[PDB]
Every structure is written in structure tokens, then in C-alpha cells.
Enzyme design. Structure first.
Site, PDB file in Angstrom:
ATOM      1  N   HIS B  41       0.747  -1.234   0.000  1.00 24.38           N
ATOM      2  CA  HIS B  41       0.000   0.000   0.000  1.00 24.38           C
ATOM      3  C   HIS B  41       0.795   1.313   0.000  1.00 24.38           C
ATOM      4  CE1 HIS B  41      -0.935  -0.492   4.423  1.00 24.38           C
ATOM      5  NE2 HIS B  41      -0.720   0.800   4.385  1.00 24.38           N
ATOM      6  N   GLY B 143       1.363   5.417   9.781  1.00 23.53           N
ATOM      7  CA  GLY B 143       2.777   5.343   9.486  1.00 23.53           C
ATOM      8  C   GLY B 143       3.489   4.149  10.084  1.00 23.53           C
ATOM      9  N   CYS B 145       2.753   0.991   9.434  1.00 30.64           N
ATOM     10  CA  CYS B 145       2.758  -0.171   8.554  1.00 30.64           C
ATOM     11  C   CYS B 145       4.176  -0.497   8.098  1.00 30.64           C
ATOM     12  CB  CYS B 145       1.867   0.069   7.345  1.00 30.64           C
ATOM     13  SG  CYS B 145       0.161   0.127   7.782  1.00 30.64           S
TER      14      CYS B 145
HETATM   15  C1  LIG Z   1      -0.321   1.799   8.297  1.00 30.32           C
HETATM   16  N1  LIG Z   1       0.517   2.722   8.394  1.00 30.32           N
HETATM   17  C2  LIG Z   1      -1.757   2.127   8.655  1.00 30.32           C
HETATM   18  C3  LIG Z   1      -1.785   1.689  10.125  1.00 30.32           C
HETATM   19  C4  LIG Z   1      -3.170   1.800  10.813  1.00 30.32           C
HETATM   20  C5  LIG Z   1      -3.553   3.467  10.936  1.00 30.32           C
HETATM   21  C6  LIG Z   1      -4.238   3.591  12.025  1.00 30.32           C
HETATM   22  N2  LIG Z   1      -3.746   2.433  12.996  1.00 30.32           N
HETATM   23  C7  LIG Z   1      -3.074   1.343  12.027  1.00 30.32           C
HETATM   24  O1  LIG Z   1      -2.590   0.330  12.394  1.00 30.32           O
HETATM   25  N3  LIG Z   1      -2.664   1.294   7.872  1.00 30.32           N
HETATM   26  C8  LIG Z   1      -3.846   1.819   7.176  1.00 30.32           C
HETATM   27  O2  LIG Z   1      -4.152   2.974   7.215  1.00 30.32           O
HETATM   28  C9  LIG Z   1      -4.723   0.772   6.398  1.00 30.32           C
HETATM   29  C10 LIG Z   1      -4.444   0.679   4.822  1.00 30.32           C
HETATM   30  C11 LIG Z   1      -5.809   1.201   4.252  1.00 30.32           C
HETATM   31  C12 LIG Z   1      -6.616   1.591   5.564  1.00 30.32           C
HETATM   32  N4  LIG Z   1      -5.981   1.079   6.538  1.00 30.32           N
HETATM   33  C13 LIG Z   1      -6.593   0.849   7.851  1.00 30.32           C
HETATM   34  O3  LIG Z   1      -5.908   0.373   8.703  1.00 30.32           O
HETATM   35  C14 LIG Z   1      -8.081   1.201   8.036  1.00 30.32           C
HETATM   36  N5  LIG Z   1      -8.700  -0.012   8.498  1.00 30.32           N
HETATM   37  C15 LIG Z   1      -9.600  -0.765   7.625  1.00 30.32           C
HETATM   38  O4  LIG Z   1      -9.878  -0.407   6.525  1.00 30.32           O
HETATM   39  C16 LIG Z   1     -10.168  -2.061   8.199  1.00 30.32           C
HETATM   40  F1  LIG Z   1     -10.981  -1.770   9.249  1.00 30.32           F
HETATM   41  F2  LIG Z   1     -10.853  -2.717   7.217  1.00 30.32           F
HETATM   42  F3  LIG Z   1      -9.104  -2.811   8.632  1.00 30.32           F
HETATM   43  C17 LIG Z   1      -8.288   2.375   9.017  1.00 30.32           C
HETATM   44  C18 LIG Z   1      -9.814   2.643   9.092  1.00 30.32           C
HETATM   45  C19 LIG Z   1      -7.526   3.615   8.487  1.00 30.32           C
HETATM   46  C20 LIG Z   1      -7.778   2.026  10.440  1.00 30.32           C
HETATM   47  C21 LIG Z   1      -5.183  -0.118   3.712  1.00 30.32           C
HETATM   48  C22 LIG Z   1      -4.585  -0.090   2.299  1.00 30.32           C
HETATM   49  C23 LIG Z   1      -5.905  -1.364   4.298  1.00 30.32           C
END
Ligand SMILES: *C(=N)[C@H](C[C@@H]1CCNC1=O)NC(=O)[C@@H]1[C@@H]2[C@H](CN1C(=O)[C@@H](NC(=O)C(F)(F)F)C(C)(C)C)C2(C)C
Ligand SMILES: *C(=N)[C@H](C[C@@H]1CCNC1=O)NC(=O)[C@@H]1[C@@H]2[C@H](CN1C(=O)[C@@H](NC(=O)C(F)(F)F)C(C)(C)C)C2(C)C
Lengths: 306, 306
Positions: B41, B143, B145
Site C-alpha cells: 500500500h 505510518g 505499517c
Molecule cells: C499503516 N501505516 C496504517 C496503520 C493503521 C492506521 C491507524 N492504525 C493502524 O494500524 N494502515 C492503514 O491505514 C490501512 C491501509 C488502508 C486503511 N488502513 C486501515 O488500517 C483502516 N482499516 C480498515 O480499513 C479495516 F478496518 F478494514 F481494517 C483504518 C480505518 C484507516 C484504520 C489499507 C490499504 C488497508
């Protein structure tokens, strides 16, 4: 989101751990530049424990009596001295992995990470608080002495604790890097007990702010309280008094959440008087007091270290 | 003595962390030999999140579009490919700090340490379990991830988790190092919920053995139970079934304490049916299920890593 007891990354410290053997005893040492720091009891036999004369025992040791090993390599000792409860062994090689560092003496209520080590090798890392009674709630076994506690600020390691000894009920005692004990303890196998501990109020408040930031808000009530009335309740429940300095340190979390510190004190007062009635806060059924305000801010904002 | 949630030392992993930026997005990467592994991503914009076509987005990127930084040094990317949900970026420099390592896929109920990182820099380290519902209870922000989970066995780092995403109620989801998600999750911002979680019975039993080893024995009762009757109770309280394999894995702790596994099952059954009546075990008011039998043995015996 999420909130977990988090330790500092341990790599900078791991780079400094060595094993020290004198006679038959082996424990851990901390190698910074050309000096290895370790607990002075490395010079004791099993016999010498009840009442050792360290100065005397050290007179009859020379540099060659200390076998220092860094990984698979012996470091030659070229000088030795005792400072309070620690020995300083000068070696002929400076540690190339020495980080930027300081020796600090922390205050009760402050937190730090411990790198638990055996034979100069790391076993694990965990986060602790210096309790108000000058002990820490650690996990240490025979051979763990010389393991250190530390904090990191950007690229600088602040060493604050060296492990020496275990007190009744499985709590732990040690010194700062200048060899001065935290608390009224001595490094001899004699009858010693920690004073009655107390709960670190400012840390509990910090953790309630962490809960709010994470959306665990059920305990917020509609009231306020004066600092004095709050402290009358805290006293009853064996909580330490909340000072204006503590109030000020909670300022960033209070500003972030919009909850005045004295309002969150009113909520804590209700939890103390009423309990939590089977509910949890951040997954805990007991109130947590080993996160400082800075720990909370650091974790919820993603502060990193160089 | 003492028992604390302990993480593995993080130095070997810290040595492998880098930052990856593609366009405007920056996340973390893992540099092993001459390859950087990161969440796919990183190639997405804020727009692309609801339903990204990763294959398509990756077609229009070339090697130079990925800016990889290891500390203060840019690593030149000379190749790229996608394997499931992770990208592999071949770089022109092999990481000199690469440890001995493996990529493993862990099973639910197993534990690991997470090195939480932001912009390629470590923030903290904590211990987690892969929950039965394929999520982990972490602490991650925007951030984070690309942060990884791992275990260490002597000198070998077994990487088992890469962080991708946060699910409702503040739980976390990710993949193995081959990019395959744990659980039924996908890396897109769509309606996703974890299944109902369950308590890891074998880990609770392991932790009760840890309590006995530490002298916290009040919950031991005078009874025994069959495996089947125990599992009838466990079921009711949303505990996972105890298998004979689990019984066998508890063998070392059972032998050390002299408490038969089915006898400790009888004690756990009583705790489930009666509660703890305001008492604690190893300082906890709730039963803990994120220590494996091996974690307990490792901590109570002082196992170190090279
Ligand atoms: C990586 N840096 C972030 C880490 C997340 C941010 C908030 N706490 C975390 O661990 N990852 C993301 O933003 C991922 C990424 C899109 C959205 N996303 C999510 O984690 C979202 N969750 C979902 O969509 C769900 F619920 F289906 F898991 C969010 C609502 C922003 C927490 C992709 C490409 C999955
Ligand atoms: C260092 N390797 C050990 C670490 C201890 C061992 C058990 N868990 C630990 O943290 N340190 C010691 O063995 C020190 C050392 C003599 C005895 N000692 C103790 O920790 C003893 N405790 C006390 O004497 C007390 F209670 F006063 F603190 C022991 C009973 C063995 C736990 C010296 C020189 C203090």
C-alpha cells in the site's frame, strides 16, 4: 490505536553487554568506551554473602583476575576501581558500539526499560517503574545482576539502573550507574525489606488520559474537585499526593483531550470510592500506574529514536 | 523471581529497518541482504484506498519511484516485484547488518515481539499474541505499517508478521513475510470486522504454572478433572478447547511443578466458575492468555539469545 506497555528498543544497550567472571562468579557488565561497569559482588564467593568486606576482597584481586568477555572475545583488563557498589574495569579496547550516553539518577514514579541478561547475553526487554519505595517490579533470576535499566531520548541512552538484588515478595533493588543504591538497601545477604509501597497517582491519571484518547471513556463523570479534596481521598487509598508539578506535567494530555486535570481527578476519585464494578479500562481490571505522562504522549504520538 | 510480559531484544531487527516512500506515502520496510520488503500500500494515494488495484498501480511505477532510506542514506532500487500483499524491492547494496533469519507463518495462540516503527525508526518494542481470530492486540498509528513481528531462537530471527491495518475496536491485522494475510482480511479500506475472539486456554494454563513457580499458589484446589469435562466448561466461558497436543506441550511445566495438567485444569475450572473474588494472580485481576508454555519456561529459566 491501542495501548501497550512498551519498552524502548534495546539495540544500543545490547551492544554494550558483556560478561564478567571473577573466580567462580559470573555476572553481566556494561562496556562503554574503555570501561566495564558491573556489580561489585562479582568478587564474592557464596561464603562472602552475609557480610562481605568489599574493600578487602578487592585488595586481593588484580586486573588479571577479572575475565571479561564480549561475545566470543576476551577483553583484557588493565585497571580496576570501586565506586560505591559498582566496579569499574578499565579495558584495553574501547567498545566500538558505544552509543551516545549519560548516567542519570531517576526519581520515583519514573519509568525505564530493563534489558534482562544472563552471561552477558540478552534474554528480554521489559518496561518498569521506580516504585515510591525504591524497588522495581522486575523479572530477574540468579545471574541477572549487572543487567541495566535505561531510557532513550533521540540517539542518547540514559542509563539509570543496574540490577543487584531481590527483596522479599519478588521485588528488585539496584543502583544507579555510580553505584549508589535506590532506597535504603545494601548489597549483602541480610534481613532487608522494602517499605510500604504507594500508587503513583500522576501515572494513573496519565493512563486515564490514554484511555480517553483510545475511546475508553465510560469512567468520565460530570464533576470536578479541588486538589486538596482529591488528595484527601488519594491518601485513604494509598495513593501518593498529587502536586502542582504533577498537574503541570499532565498539561499536554489535558490540552489534547480537553479534560481539565481536576476534572479527571474527580473521575479517579469516583473509581477509588466505587470500584470499577467488573468493567475494564484499556483491557485492565486494575488501575495502572507504570505509564508516565511522557510515556503516554510518546506512545500515542509515535515518537521514534535515532 | 517475578514475571513480566517480556519482549525479545530488538537489536537484530532494528538493524534491518528502513523507510520507504513512494510518491507521498512513507512507511517502513525490512532490509534483508539486498531486498527491502514492505506493504504494497505504499504505492497508494489517499484516494486509492477504498478499492485499490495494486497490480495496476504497480505497473506505472519504476524502480526510481521508490525512495528507500536506511538511516541517513538512500539505497538505490534496482528491481521490484509484488508477492501477495508485500513488495520486494531489490536494492544495490546488501544490508551488512542482516541477521541469520527465517520467514515463518505462526499459528494462532503463538506469541511474538513487535518492533513498532515510524519513518524507518524504532519507537518501541512489545510482546503480542496471534489471537484465535487472526488479529493482534497492538499499538499502532498512522505510518506504522511495515513494522514487523518476530521471534528469536539463539541467533536466528524468525520474522512472522508485517503490520498492515487496524480493525474496529483497536485491533490489528497483517501478513506474514510472504504477504499472505493472517485471517480473512484484505488491504483495502472497506467494511471489515474480526470474528469473535476466544481465550487461549493452553496459555492461561502456562501462566498459572508461572504463578506457582513464583509462589502465587492460592488458586490450587484439591481436585482433578477429565479432559472432556474440562472442555465442556471451557466452551461455556469462550475458552478454546484444550487438545492432547496442548497437554503434551505443558509437560515441562507440569514436571517442574509436580502438578498434573488435568489437576491444573481442575483449578482453572474453579476460577472460571467462581471468579477470583477480588484476588490477583501474578498481580493480575484477569486471567492472562498471552504467555505460551515456551515463554514461561524461557523467562523462568533465563534463556538468552546470541
Ligand atoms: C499503516 N501505516 C496504517 C496503520 C493503521 C492506521 C491507524 N492504525 C493502524 O494500524 N494502515 C492503514 O491505514 C490501512 C491501509 C488502508 C486503511 N488502513 C486501515 O488500517 C483502516 N482499516 C480498515 O480499513 C479495516 F478496518 F478494514 F481494517 C483504518 C480505518 C484507516 C484504520 C489499507 C490499504 C488497508
Ligand atoms: C544477581 N545475579 C542476583 C539476582 C537475584 C537472585 C535471585 N533474583 C535476583 O534478582 N543477586 C543476589 O543474589 C544478591 C547479592 C547477595 C544476595 N542477593 C539477593 O538478591 C538476596 N536478597 C537479599 O539478600 C535481600 F533480600 F536483602 F535483598 C537473595 C535472598 C538471594 C534474593 C548480594 C551481594 C546482595
Amino acid at each position: 490505536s491501542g495501548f501497550r506497555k512498551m519498552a524502548f528498543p534495546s539495540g544500543k544497550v545490547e551492544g554494550c553487554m558483556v560478561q564478567v567472571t571473577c573466580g567462580t562468579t559470573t555476572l553481566n557488565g556494561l562496556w562503554l568506551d574503555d570501561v566495564v561497569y558491573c556489580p561489585r559482588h562479582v568478587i564474592c564467593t557464596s561464603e562472602d554473602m552475609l557480610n562481605p568486606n568489599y574493600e578487602d576482597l578487592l585488595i586481593r584481586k588484580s586486573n588479571h583476575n577479572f575475565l571479561v568477555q564480549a561475545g566470543n572475545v576476551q577483553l583484557r583488563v588493565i585497571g580496576h576501581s570501586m565506586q560505591n557498589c559498582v566496579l569499574k574495569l578499565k579495558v584495553d579496547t574501547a567498545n566500538p558500539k558505544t552509543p551516545k550516553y549519560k548516567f542519570v539518577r531517576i526519581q520515583p514514579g519514573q519509568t525505564f526499560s530493563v534489558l534482562a541478561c544472563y552471561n552477558g547475553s540478552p534474554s528480554g526487554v521489559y518496561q518498569c517503574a521506580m516504585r515510591p519505595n525504591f524497588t522495581i517490579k522486575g523479572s530477574f533470576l540468579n545471574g541477572s545482576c549487572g543487567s541495566v535499566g535505561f531510557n532513550i531520548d533521540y540517539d542518547c541512552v540514559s542509563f539509570c539502573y543496574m540490577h543487584h538484588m531481590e527483596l522479599p515478595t519478588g521485588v528488585h533493588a539496584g543502583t544507579d550507574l555510580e553505584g549508589n543504591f535506590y532506597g535504603p538497601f545494601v548489597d549483602r545477604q541480610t534481613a532487608q525489606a522494602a517499605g510500604t509501597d504507594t500508587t503513583i497517582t500522576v501515572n494513573v491519571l496519565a493512563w486515564l488520559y490514554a484511555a480517553v484518547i483510545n475511546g475508553d471513556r465510560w469512567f468520565l463523570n460530570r464533576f470536578t474537585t479541588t486538589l486538596n479534596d482529591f488528595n484527601l481521598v488519594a491518601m485513604k487509598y494509598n495513593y501518593e499526593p498529587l502536586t502542582q508539578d504533577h498537574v503541570d506535567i499532565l498539561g499536554p494530555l489535558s490540552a489534547q483531550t480537553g479534560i481539565a486535570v481536576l476534572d479527571m481527578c474527580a473521575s479517579l476519585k469516583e473509581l477509588l470510592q466505587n470500584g470499577m464494578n467488573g468493567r475494564t479500562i484499556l483491557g485492565s481490571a486494575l488501575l495502572e500506574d507504570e505509564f508516565t505522562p511522557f510515556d503516554v504522549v510518546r506512545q500515542c504520538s509515535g515518537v521514534t529514536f535515532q
